[PDB]
Design a protein around this motif. Structure first.
Motif, PDB file in Angstrom:
ATOM      1  N   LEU H  16     108.105 137.907  43.127  1.00 27.59           N
ATOM      2  CA  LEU H  16     107.298 138.484  42.060  1.00 27.59           C
ATOM      3  C   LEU H  16     106.918 137.462  41.010  1.00 27.59           C
ATOM      4  O   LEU H  16     105.863 137.579  40.386  1.00 27.59           O
ATOM      5  CB  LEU H  16     108.055 139.620  41.395  1.00 27.59           C
ATOM      6  CG  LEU H  16     107.741 141.000  41.925  1.00 27.59           C
ATOM      7  CD1 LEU H  16     108.675 142.013  41.315  1.00 27.59           C
ATOM      8  CD2 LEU H  16     106.323 141.296  41.562  1.00 27.59           C
ATOM      9  N   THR H  19     103.939 135.025  42.165  1.00 31.18           N
ATOM     10  CA  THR H  19     102.611 135.618  42.196  1.00 31.18           C
ATOM     11  C   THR H  19     102.019 135.723  40.806  1.00 31.18           C
ATOM     12  O   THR H  19     100.836 135.436  40.614  1.00 31.18           O
ATOM     13  CB  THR H  19     102.663 137.003  42.819  1.00 31.18           C
ATOM     14  OG1 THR H  19     103.251 137.916  41.897  1.00 31.18           O
ATOM     15  CG2 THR H  19     103.533 136.945  44.014  1.00 31.18           C
ATOM     16  N   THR H  22     100.587 132.497  39.847  1.00 26.16           N
ATOM     17  CA  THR H  22      99.210 132.335  40.306  1.00 26.16           C
ATOM     18  C   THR H  22      98.392 133.481  39.734  1.00 26.16           C
ATOM     19  O   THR H  22      97.949 134.384  40.442  1.00 26.16           O
ATOM     20  CB  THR H  22      99.142 132.322  41.825  1.00 26.16           C
ATOM     21  OG1 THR H  22      99.202 133.670  42.305  1.00 26.16           O
ATOM     22  CG2 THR H  22     100.299 131.530  42.403  1.00 26.16           C
ATOM     23  N   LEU H  23      98.217 133.455  38.419  1.00 23.68           N
ATOM     24  CA  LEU H  23      97.442 134.514  37.787  1.00 23.68           C
ATOM     25  C   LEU H  23      96.531 133.997  36.683  1.00 23.68           C
ATOM     26  O   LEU H  23      96.041 134.809  35.894  1.00 23.68           O
ATOM     27  CB  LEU H  23      98.372 135.593  37.236  1.00 23.68           C
ATOM     28  CG  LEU H  23      97.801 136.997  37.093  1.00 23.68           C
ATOM     29  CD1 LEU H  23      97.453 137.516  38.452  1.00 23.68           C
ATOM     30  CD2 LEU H  23      98.799 137.902  36.434  1.00 23.68           C
ATOM     31  N   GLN H  56      94.967 142.155  30.336  1.00 23.17           N
ATOM     32  CA  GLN H  56      95.809 141.251  31.102  1.00 23.17           C
ATOM     33  C   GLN H  56      97.283 141.606  31.010  1.00 23.17           C
ATOM     34  O   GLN H  56      98.072 141.103  31.811  1.00 23.17           O
ATOM     35  CB  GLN H  56      95.599 139.824  30.623  1.00 23.17           C
ATOM     36  CG  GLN H  56      94.521 139.094  31.354  1.00 23.17           C
ATOM     37  CD  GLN H  56      94.038 137.892  30.597  1.00 23.17           C
ATOM     38  OE1 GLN H  56      93.882 137.938  29.381  1.00 23.17           O
ATOM     39  NE2 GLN H  56      93.796 136.801  31.307  1.00 23.17           N
ATOM     40  N   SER H  58      98.331 144.884  31.219  1.00 23.02           N
ATOM     41  CA  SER H  58      98.462 145.889  32.265  1.00 23.02           C
ATOM     42  C   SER H  58      98.355 145.268  33.648  1.00 23.02           C
ATOM     43  O   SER H  58      98.883 145.818  34.616  1.00 23.02           O
ATOM     44  CB  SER H  58      97.413 146.980  32.087  1.00 23.02           C
ATOM     45  OG  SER H  58      97.108 147.156  30.719  1.00 23.02           O
ATOM     46  N   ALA H  59      97.674 144.132  33.767  1.00 22.99           N
ATOM     47  CA  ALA H  59      97.699 143.401  35.023  1.00 22.99           C
ATOM     48  C   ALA H  59      99.130 143.076  35.416  1.00 22.99           C
ATOM     49  O   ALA H  59      99.632 143.549  36.436  1.00 22.99           O
ATOM     50  CB  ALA H  59      96.866 142.129  34.904  1.00 22.99           C
ATOM     51  N   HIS H  62     101.510 146.223  35.852  1.00 24.90           N
ATOM     52  CA  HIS H  62     101.337 146.943  37.105  1.00 24.90           C
ATOM     53  C   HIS H  62     101.615 146.058  38.305  1.00 24.90           C
ATOM     54  O   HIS H  62     102.097 146.544  39.330  1.00 24.90           O
ATOM     55  CB  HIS H  62      99.930 147.513  37.175  1.00 24.90           C
ATOM     56  CG  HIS H  62      99.693 148.629  36.215  1.00 24.90           C
ATOM     57  ND1 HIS H  62      99.943 149.943  36.533  1.00 24.90           N
ATOM     58  CD2 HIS H  62      99.242 148.628  34.941  1.00 24.90           C
ATOM     59  CE1 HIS H  62      99.648 150.706  35.498  1.00 24.90           C
ATOM     60  NE2 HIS H  62      99.222 149.932  34.518  1.00 24.90           N
ATOM     61  N   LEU H  63     101.331 144.765  38.194  1.00 27.52           N
ATOM     62  CA  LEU H  63     101.705 143.809  39.221  1.00 27.52           C
ATOM     63  C   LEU H  63     103.196 143.809  39.507  1.00 27.52           C
ATOM     64  O   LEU H  63     103.612 143.248  40.522  1.00 27.52           O
ATOM     65  CB  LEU H  63     101.279 142.418  38.784  1.00 27.52           C
ATOM     66  CG  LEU H  63     100.999 141.387  39.848  1.00 27.52           C
ATOM     67  CD1 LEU H  63      99.970 141.963  40.776  1.00 27.52           C
ATOM     68  CD2 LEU H  63     100.478 140.134  39.195  1.00 27.52           C
ATOM     69  N   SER H  65     105.301 146.756  38.224  1.00 31.86           N
ATOM     70  CA  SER H  65     105.698 148.153  38.330  1.00 31.86           C
ATOM     71  C   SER H  65     105.479 148.703  39.729  1.00 31.86           C
ATOM     72  O   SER H  65     106.134 149.673  40.121  1.00 31.86           O
ATOM     73  CB  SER H  65     104.928 148.992  37.324  1.00 31.86           C
ATOM     74  OG  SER H  65     105.061 150.363  37.629  1.00 31.86           O
ATOM     75  N   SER H  66     104.565 148.111  40.489  1.00 32.85           N
ATOM     76  CA  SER H  66     104.257 148.581  41.829  1.00 32.85           C
ATOM     77  C   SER H  66     105.027 147.833  42.902  1.00 32.85           C
ATOM     78  O   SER H  66     105.329 148.409  43.950  1.00 32.85           O
ATOM     79  CB  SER H  66     102.757 148.459  42.093  1.00 32.85           C
ATOM     80  OG  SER H  66     102.041 149.466  41.402  1.00 32.85           O
ATOM     81  N   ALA H  67     105.368 146.577  42.663  1.00 31.91           N
ATOM     82  CA  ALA H  67     106.129 145.801  43.625  1.00 31.91           C
ATOM     83  C   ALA H  67     107.598 146.186  43.688  1.00 31.91           C
ATOM     84  O   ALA H  67     108.328 145.614  44.498  1.00 31.91           O
ATOM     85  CB  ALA H  67     106.014 144.320  43.296  1.00 31.91           C
ATOM     86  N   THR H  77     109.052 145.034  30.618  1.00 37.44           N
ATOM     87  CA  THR H  77     109.014 144.310  29.359  1.00 37.44           C
ATOM     88  C   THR H  77     108.386 142.949  29.585  1.00 37.44           C
ATOM     89  O   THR H  77     108.884 142.161  30.390  1.00 37.44           O
ATOM     90  CB  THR H  77     110.423 144.153  28.798  1.00 37.44           C
ATOM     91  OG1 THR H  77     110.935 145.433  28.417  1.00 37.44           O
ATOM     92  CG2 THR H  77     110.426 143.220  27.627  1.00 37.44           C
TER      93      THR H  77
END
Lengths: 88, 88, 88, 88, 88, 88, 88, 88, 88, 88, 88, 88, 88, 88, 88, 88, 88, 88, 88, 88, 88
Positions: H16, H19, H22-23, H56, H58-59, H62-63, H65-67, H77
């Motif tokens: 996590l 990734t 790389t954002l 950015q 919420s990016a 959620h990046l 919170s979903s993984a 946080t």
């Protein structure tokens, strides 16, 4: 459980006898115990030319009645080397 | 469970005797215990030309009645080397 | 479970005796314990030409009544090297 | 479970004694514990020409009553090298 | 389960003592714990020519009452090298 | 299950102490924990010529009350190298 | 099941600390967790001549309250290298 | 069943993080997960001279919170390298 | 039963990513799945100077929502390399 | 029972893909199946300069919906190499 | 019980395909079966310049619906090499 | 119990085919059986320039319906090498 | 219990065939049995230029219906080498 | 229990046949038994230029109906080498 | 349990005899015991020219009745070397 | 239990046959027994130019009906070498 | 349990006989015991020219009736070497 | 239990036969027994030019009916070497 | 338990016989016992020219009736070497 | 339990025969016993030119009826070497 | 339990016979016993030119009826060497 219950008695008898032997007018004693209602029979050879007085009988009778568990002084038989059953 | 219950007693008797021996007018003692309602019988040879006084009997009687578990001073038999059952 | 219960007592007795020995007018003591209703019997040889006072008896009696579990000071028997049952 | 319960006590007693030894007017102490209703008996040799004051008795009594689990200060017996039962 | 419960205590006592030692007017301490209703007894040798004030007693009492589980500050006994039971 | 429960505590105490050491006016700390109703006792040597302010006490108290599970800040005892029980 | 539950915590604490270290005005942090009702205590040394603002406290508090399961941000204690308990 | 549940998490966190790295305006991230009621804490160092816009956040929220299974976007946080708790 | 359930997922994620990579305006993707209530998070780097249209989002969302058992297209999070949370 | 259930699927997917590949305007396909409520996602790269007609979509959809047990043609997702989610 | 249930199917599919291949206007076929409610999907490449008549579809459909246990002729999907889903 | 139930069928099919082959206007046959409700599908290549009459269909249908247990003549599918589903 | 039940049948069929072969106008026969409701199918090649009369059919039908347990003469199918299903 | 039940029958059949062979107008016989409701089928080649009379049929029928347990003479089928089912 | 119950008796008899032998007018005795309701029979050879008086009979009778458990003096039979059943 | 029940019968049959052989007008016999409801079938070749009279049939019938347990003389079938079922 | 019950009796009989032998007018005896209701039979050869008086019979009868457990003097049979059944 | 029940009978039959052989007008006999309801069948070859009288039949019948357990004389069948069933 | 019950009897009989042999007018005896209701039979050869008187019969009868357990004197049979059943 | 029950009988028969042989007008006998309801059959060859009288039949009948357990004299069959069933 | 029950009888019979042999007018006897309801049969060869009187029969009858357990004198059969059944 048996062959040393009667091997204990074989030494208690031989110990009780060696103390009565060291008692003055007793040249040698010989005890047998009957431990199931117990009783004992002491045969004593008095010193040459002696005789156990009436109190010296209670000496040997109690000297044995107490060294054995549960044996009253009435069940102890004392006998000289000349017959003479001393204890009633 | 047996051959050292009676091997304990064989040394307690020989220990109780070595203390009565160190008691003044007692040249040598010889204790036997009856531990099932217990009782004991002490045979003492007094020093040549001595005699245990009436209080010296309670010495040896209590010296033994207390060193053994559950043995009252009434069940202890004391005897000289001349008959003479001392303890009633 | 037995041969070291009575091997513990064999050293407790020999420890209790070595402390009474270091007590002034006590040249050597000799303790026996009766641990089933417990009791003990102390035989002390006083220093040559001494005698335990009435308070020195409670010293040795409590010195032993407390070092053993459950033994009251009434069940402790103290005896000199001259008969003389000191503790009632 | 036994031979180190009484081997623990053998060092606790020897530890409690080495602290009372470092207490000023105490040249050497000697503790015995009675742990089943517990009790202890301390024998102290005071420094030559000293005597424990009435508060110095509660020092040694509490110094021992607290180092042992469940032993009240009333069951601790303190004795000098001259008889003298100090703790009531 | 036993021989390291009492081997833990043997180091906790020796750890608690090395901290009281680093406390200023305490040249050396010596703690014993009674963990079954717990209690402890601290013996401290103060620095030559010092005396613990009334607040310095609660220092050492709480320094020990808290380092041991369940031991209130009332069951902690503090004693100098001169008798002097400090904690009531 | 025991010899590393108390070997964990032996390092947690030594870890908690090395952090209080890095706290400014604390030259060295020494923590003991009482984990059964928990409590802890911190002894701190302040830097030469310093004294912990009233807020610096809650620093060290919470620095310890939080690093241990279930220990409230009221059961933490803080003590200087000069007596001085700081935490009530 | 235990010696790596507390060996996991030993690295989680050392991981949480290395992230707070990379946080700007934090030269080094030192986390301890109390995981049974959890809590944590962070001690941070700020960069020479800095001070954490009131929002930078919630940074470090949430940076830790979220990295540990079940630990609310109220049970996290933050402390500088100068006393200064920052989190209420 | 444990030492690879937490060894799985040790790589999921490190995956996590690589990734989020790389954002764009994220030079390096550092994730910690709290999986028992889950939560996570991301610490990101933004590219020198950048700042995450409000979308950015919420990016990255959620990046993460979903993984992770069961982790809502409210329990994540996000924190910069300058304090700045970004996620409420 | 565990170390290849999560080793299956480690390749399904790496397989799902290699197909999104072969999708035109997607230079590289990076999928993470959350399979206990499932969800996934795709991070895509678009080809330099491109942007996913509103229908190209449902391409990647359904390309992932269908390749995983039980994952609806609402629980799939798509994110560019410039923040830009694309899926609501 | 698991590591070849998912190793079967790994070849069924690679078999289903090699048949869609031999379908005319399909230069290469790439199938993923979601077999617990099943579903599949096909990504096809069409031959350069082609486009699947509306009936050619039901070809590939049924070519996959039938080769997998229990998968209806509504749960099959078809996607080009240019976004373009073809199956509703 | 599994790895040869699906290894049986792998040859039944390859056997069913080699018979449809020997059927005139079928240059090569490719069958997949879905045996849990069964179904199959046949993809046939017709001979160059041919087309299956409406009765030749029931040939291949029944040629497959009968070679598999429980598969009705309605669940068989036939597809050319040019899209063209032939079986409704 | 399985790998030779389907290895029996593999030879019964190859035996049934070699008898239909020796039937006059049948250059080669190819049988598949569906034994769970059974059924079979025969594909026959007729001799060049021949065609099975309406009675020659019941020959091959019964030649197969009887060689298999429980298979009625209605569940047998006969197909030429030119499509031509012969059995209704 | 299976691989020689069907290996028995494999020889019974080959035995029944070698007897029908020795029957006059039968150059070679070929029997298959269906033993679960039994049935059989005989294919006979008649001698060149012969034809089985209507009674010669009951010969071969009963020659087989009796050599197999439980097979009635109605479930026996006889077929020439020229189609010609002989038994109704 | 099976492979010699049918190996017994294999010799009983070959024994029954060698006796019918020694019967005059029978050059060779060939028996098959159906032992589960039993039945048998005898095929006899008569001596060149002979024919079994109506009583010679009951000879062979009873010669077989009696040599097999439970087989009535009605379930025995006799057939020449020229068709000719002899037993009704 | 038997072969030394009767081997004990074999020596008790030989011991009881050797004591009666040492009894004055008894040159040799010979005892047999009947221990199941017990009884004994003593045969004595008197010294040449002697005769047991009426009290000397109760000597030997009690000398034996007491040395054996449960044997009354009425069940003891004494016999000379000249017939002469002495005990009634 | 089977392979010598039918190996017993194989010799009983061959023994019964060798006795009928020694019967005058019987050049050789051949017995088969049907022992489950028993029955037997004897085939006899008479001496050249002889014929069994009506009483000689009961000879052979009873010669067999009695040598086998439970076989009545009605279930015995006698047949010459010229057909001729002799026993009804 | 048997072969030494009767081997004990074999010596008791031979012991009882050797004592009766030493009885004056008995040159040799020979005892047999009947121990299940017991009884014995003694055969004695008297010294040449002697005869057992009426009291000498009760000697030998009781000499045997008492040496055996449970044998009354009425069940003992005494017989000379000249017939002469002595005991009624 | 079987292979010597019928091997016993094989010798009893051969023994019974060798006694009938030694019976005068019987050159050789041959017995068979039927022991499950028993019965036997004797075949005797008489001496050349002899014939068993009507009483000589009961000789052989009873000679066999009695040598076998439970076989009445009515179930014994006697037959000459010339047919001639002798026993009804 | 049997082969020495009857081997005991074999010697008891041979012992009982050797005693009757030593009985005067009995040159040799020979006893047999019947021990299940017991009985015995004695055969005696008298000395040449002697005869057992009527009392000498009860000698031998009781000499045997008593040496065997439970055998009354009425069940003993005495017989000379000249017939002459002596005991009724 | 069987092969020596019938091997016992094989010698009892051969023993019973050797005694009848030594019976005067019996040159050789031959006994067979039927022991399940017992019976026996004796065949005797008389001395050349002799005949058993009517009382000599009861000799041999009882000589056998008594030597076998439970066999009455009515079930014994006696037969000469000339037929002649002697016992009814 | 059997092969020496009948091997005991084999010697008892041979012992009983050797005593009857030593009986005067009996040159040799031969006993057989029937022990299940017992019985015996004695065959005696008398001395040449002798005959057993009517009392000499009861000699041998009782000589056998008593040597065997439970055999009455009525079940004993005595037979000479000349027929002559002596015992009724």
């Amino acid at each position: 459980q048996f062959s040393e219950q009667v091997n204990y008695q074989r030494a208690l008898e031989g110990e009780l006898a060696r103390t009565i032997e060291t008692l003055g007018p007793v040249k040698s004693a010989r005890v047998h115990l009957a431990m199931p209602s117990p009783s004992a029979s002491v045969t004593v050879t008095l010193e040459p030319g002696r005789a156990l007085d009436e109190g010296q009988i209670s000496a040997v009778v109690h000297l044995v009645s107490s060294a054995v568990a549960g044996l009253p002084p009435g069940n102890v038989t004392l006998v000289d080397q000349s017959g003479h059953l001393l204890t009633q």
